[PDB]
Design an enzyme around this catalytic site. Structure first.
Site, PDB file in Angstrom:
ATOM      1  N   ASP A  74      -1.031   4.798   8.025  1.00  0.00           N
ATOM      2  CA  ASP A  74      -1.203   3.348   8.132  1.00  0.00           C
ATOM      3  C   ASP A  74      -1.873   2.816   9.393  1.00  0.00           C
ATOM      4  O   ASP A  74      -1.994   3.822  10.210  1.00  0.00           O
ATOM      5  CB  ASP A  74       0.467   2.556   8.306  1.00  0.00           C
ATOM      6  CG  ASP A  74       0.385   1.239   8.070  1.00  0.00           C
ATOM      7  OD1 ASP A  74       1.520   0.555   8.398  1.00  0.00           O
ATOM      8  OD2 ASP A  74      -0.600   0.754   7.786  1.00  0.00           O
ATOM      9  N   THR A 113      -5.270  -2.472   8.038  1.00  0.00           N
ATOM     10  CA  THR A 113      -4.820  -3.790   7.957  1.00  0.00           C
ATOM     11  C   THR A 113      -6.041  -4.669   8.078  1.00  0.00           C
ATOM     12  O   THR A 113      -5.639  -5.919   8.454  1.00  0.00           O
ATOM     13  CB  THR A 113      -3.662  -4.061   8.770  1.00  0.00           C
ATOM     14  OG1 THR A 113      -4.236  -4.042   9.970  1.00  0.00           O
ATOM     15  CG2 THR A 113      -2.665  -3.112   8.617  1.00  0.00           C
ATOM     16  N   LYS A 120       0.885  -1.444  -0.125  1.00  0.00           N
ATOM     17  CA  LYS A 120       0.047  -0.111  -0.030  1.00  0.00           C
ATOM     18  C   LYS A 120       0.995   1.254  -0.043  1.00  0.00           C
ATOM     19  O   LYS A 120       0.750   2.001  -0.796  1.00  0.00           O
ATOM     20  CB  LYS A 120      -0.885  -0.026   1.282  1.00  0.00           C
ATOM     21  CG  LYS A 120      -2.055  -1.096   1.325  1.00  0.00           C
ATOM     22  CD  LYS A 120      -2.895  -1.173   2.497  1.00  0.00           C
ATOM     23  CE  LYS A 120      -3.831  -1.990   2.439  1.00  0.00           C
ATOM     24  NZ  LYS A 120      -4.649  -1.830   3.569  1.00  0.00           N
ATOM     25  N   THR A 121       1.696   1.364   0.983  1.00  0.00           N
ATOM     26  CA  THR A 121       2.588   2.490   1.041  1.00  0.00           C
ATOM     27  C   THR A 121       3.378   2.940  -0.123  1.00  0.00           C
ATOM     28  O   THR A 121       3.832   3.954  -0.639  1.00  0.00           O
ATOM     29  CB  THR A 121       3.540   2.461   2.069  1.00  0.00           C
ATOM     30  OG1 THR A 121       2.944   2.395   3.347  1.00  0.00           O
ATOM     31  CG2 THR A 121       4.807   3.653   2.023  1.00  0.00           C
ATOM     32  N   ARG A 175       5.745  -8.533   0.417  1.00  0.00           N
ATOM     33  CA  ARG A 175       6.491  -8.554   1.705  1.00  0.00           C
ATOM     34  C   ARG A 175       7.647  -9.795   2.057  1.00  0.00           C
ATOM     35  O   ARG A 175       8.873  -9.457   1.817  1.00  0.00           O
ATOM     36  CB  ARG A 175       5.943  -8.107   2.992  1.00  0.00           C
ATOM     37  CG  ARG A 175       6.758  -7.371   3.635  1.00  0.00           C
ATOM     38  CD  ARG A 175       6.135  -6.975   5.245  1.00  0.00           C
ATOM     39  NE  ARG A 175       5.841  -8.376   6.031  1.00  0.00           N
ATOM     40  CZ  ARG A 175       6.438  -9.008   6.603  1.00  0.00           C
ATOM     41  NH1 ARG A 175       8.252  -8.787   6.252  1.00  0.00           N
ATOM     42  NH2 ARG A 175       6.576 -10.048   7.105  1.00  0.00           N
TER      43      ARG A 175
HETATM   44  N1  LIG Z   1       3.185  -3.622  -6.579  1.00  0.00           N
HETATM   45  C1  LIG Z   1       4.790  -3.580  -6.511  1.00  0.00           C
HETATM   46  N2  LIG Z   1       5.523  -3.375  -7.675  1.00  0.00           N
HETATM   47  C2  LIG Z   1       6.728  -3.449  -7.403  1.00  0.00           C
HETATM   48  N3  LIG Z   1       7.454  -3.435  -6.177  1.00  0.00           N
HETATM   49  C3  LIG Z   1       6.547  -3.523  -5.219  1.00  0.00           C
HETATM   50  C4  LIG Z   1       5.154  -3.524  -5.194  1.00  0.00           C
HETATM   51  N4  LIG Z   1       4.670  -3.632  -3.930  1.00  0.00           N
HETATM   52  C5  LIG Z   1       5.635  -3.477  -3.152  1.00  0.00           C
HETATM   53  N5  LIG Z   1       6.808  -3.438  -3.796  1.00  0.00           N
HETATM   54  C6  LIG Z   1       8.218  -3.498  -3.070  1.00  0.00           C
HETATM   55  O1  LIG Z   1       8.425  -4.553  -2.034  1.00  0.00           O
HETATM   56  C7  LIG Z   1       8.728  -3.863  -1.003  1.00  0.00           C
HETATM   57  C8  LIG Z   1       8.217  -4.349   0.470  1.00  0.00           C
HETATM   58  O2  LIG Z   1       6.676  -4.292   0.518  1.00  0.00           O
HETATM   59  P1  LIG Z   1       5.894  -3.791   1.297  1.00  0.00           P
HETATM   60  O3  LIG Z   1       6.101  -4.708   2.853  1.00  0.00           O
HETATM   61  O4  LIG Z   1       4.413  -3.598   1.029  1.00  0.00           O
HETATM   62  O5  LIG Z   1       6.298  -2.239   2.032  1.00  0.00           O
HETATM   63  P2  LIG Z   1       5.635  -0.746   1.765  1.00  0.00           P
HETATM   64  O6  LIG Z   1       4.866  -0.551   0.535  1.00  0.00           O
HETATM   65  O7  LIG Z   1       6.521   0.284   2.055  1.00  0.00           O
HETATM   66  N6  LIG Z   1       4.620  -0.667   3.180  1.00  0.00           N
HETATM   67  P3  LIG Z   1       3.147  -1.461   3.358  1.00  0.00           P
HETATM   68  O8  LIG Z   1       1.813  -0.747   2.530  1.00  0.00           O
HETATM   69  O9  LIG Z   1       2.848  -1.055   4.939  1.00  0.00           O
HETATM   70  O10 LIG Z   1       3.260  -2.992   3.268  1.00  0.00           O
HETATM   71  C9  LIG Z   1       8.475  -2.339  -0.994  1.00  0.00           C
HETATM   72  O11 LIG Z   1       9.165  -1.502  -0.235  1.00  0.00           O
HETATM   73  C10 LIG Z   1       8.723  -2.154  -2.476  1.00  0.00           C
HETATM   74  O12 LIG Z   1      10.042  -1.853  -2.859  1.00  0.00           O
END
Ligand SMILES: Nc1ncnc2c1ncn2[C@@H]1O[C@H](COP(=O)(O)OP(=O)(O)NP(=O)(O)O)[C@@H](O)[C@H]1O
Lengths: 50, 315
Positions: free
Chosen positions: B94, B143, B48-49, B202
């Site tokens: 969040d 969440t 999401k972030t 993740r």
């Molecule tokens: N749709 C996507 N396409 C490409 N890379 C992605 C995508 N979604 C997530 N990522 C990568 O995967 C990493 C880990 O994902 P994530 O745990 O969701 O971090 P976040 O987006 O910063 N936080 P959150 O939304 O709370 O989960 C991110 O920091 C991105 O660099």
């Protein structure tokens, strides 16, 4: 005292800051610029309060 | 290890959402300047972030980030809304469903007329002072859509759900993420990680770390299906994605405890571990895989759980 400050102080308090702690920063801020408006005084204090 | 996607095109999956956002996006990207407030529902680890930074990019604005728990008092929020943001910017929150009641009450006005109204003293006076705020777009996330958000929901223009990613997409990540780190890996390899990643981005990146960690600690030329499989094998992950402690958990709930309503507490200390943990961390997936169903008594394994381990179906 000052209208602008009392206003600024009460608001800070409403926002949940230690009443006393808020006054000290507001008042000093006031000393820097006596003609400040309550809104700028509040925001300027909002970034010095814990 | 500090670079992520920037353009919405560079964003993987969520095609359904990308189209809708792309619309709402290019609109306000053309009309005035602020995107309508977006609330994202969806499971953890879905990125999401990241969508938050991407959208921010599409608009050419900055991104402030905070959590519900953090806003411990309206002030904490007023501080962010008055100083942290600049005309156009996006504040992402969040766990937004854990905002202090007061905090949330002060947020409505912020979203509506971009103003925060504070009530001074009391009695017949009951005068109020307002903080003129910059136009901004709030992007909240929970969440757990499960009604725990108040009518703050009615203040959100857009409201979508992020879905789990297909292993191909998750793979596409590891893939176009390794080229970034030089790391040589073959399509299937990554795709083998996808299958193991619990559909969430993740775990994927995490697992790829672990896998690339154990790997190159022996070679350097390339991670292929075999290399990948052996690495995963080492860390102990089956085709279903369970981990070392995952099997061990639904294990001690069969031989040590008959395949019947055990009971959280009677399980935690039962096999040395904490309930909240073995409930807010391990049980989720095990359940989403139908191998550990919670009953109004304790805990029960399923005829499938036994199978995955190789035991005959007891009546
Ligand atoms: N749709 C996507 N396409 C490409 N890379 C992605 C995508 N979604 C997530 N990522 C990568 O995967 C990493 C880990 O994902 P994530 O745990 O969701 O971090 P976040 O987006 O910063 N936080 P959150 O939304 O709370 O989960 C991110 O920091 C991105 O660099």
């Amino acid at each position: 005292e000052s209208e602008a400050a009392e206003e600024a102080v009460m608001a800070l308090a409403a926002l949940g800051f230690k009443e006393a702690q808020a006054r000290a920063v507001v008042l000093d801020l006031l000393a820097q610029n006596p003609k400040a408006r309550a809104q700028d005084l509040i925001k300027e204090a909002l970034k010095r309060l814990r | 290890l500090a670079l992520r996607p920037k353009t919405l095109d560079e964003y993987i999956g969520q095609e359904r959402l990308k189209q809708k956002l792309r619309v709402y996006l290019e609109a306000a990207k053309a009309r005035k300047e602020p995107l309508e407030h977006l609330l994202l529902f969806g499971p953890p680890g879905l990125g999401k972030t990241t969508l938050a930074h991407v959208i921010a990019h599409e608009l050419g604005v900055n991104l402030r980030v905070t959590s519900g728990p953090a806003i411990e008092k309206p002030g904490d929020l007023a501080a962010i809304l008055a100083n942290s943001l600049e005309e156009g910017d996006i504040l992402f929150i969040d766990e937004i469903h854990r905002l202090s009641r007061q905090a949330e009450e002060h947020l409505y006005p912020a979203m509506e007329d971009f103003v925060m109204d504070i009530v001074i003293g009391q009695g017949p006076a009951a005068r109020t002072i307002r903080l003129e705020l910059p136009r901004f777009t709030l992007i909240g996330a929970t969440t757990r859509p499960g009604l725990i958000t108040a009518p703050l929901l009615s203040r959100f223009g857009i409201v979508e759900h992020l879905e789990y990613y297909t292993p191909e997409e998750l793979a596409q990540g590891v893939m176009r993420d390794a080229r970034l780190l030089g790391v040589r890996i073959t399509e299937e390899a990554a795709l083998e990680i996808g299958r193991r990643s619990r559909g969430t981005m993740r775990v994927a990146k995490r697992l790829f770390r672990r896998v690339r960690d154990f790997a190159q600690v022996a070679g350097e030329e390339v991670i292929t299906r075999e290399r990948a499989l052996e690495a995963l094998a080492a860390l102990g992950l089956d085709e279903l994605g369970l981990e070392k402690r995952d099997r061990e958990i639904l294990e001690v709930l069969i031989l040590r405890f008959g395949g019947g309503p055990v009971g959280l507490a009677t399980l935690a200390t039962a096999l040395s571990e904490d309930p909240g943990t073995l409930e807010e961390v391990h049980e989720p997936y095990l359940i989403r895989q139908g191998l550990l169903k919670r009953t109004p008594r304790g805990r029960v394994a399923t005829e499938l759980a036994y199978r995955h381990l190789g035991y005959p179906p007891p009546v």
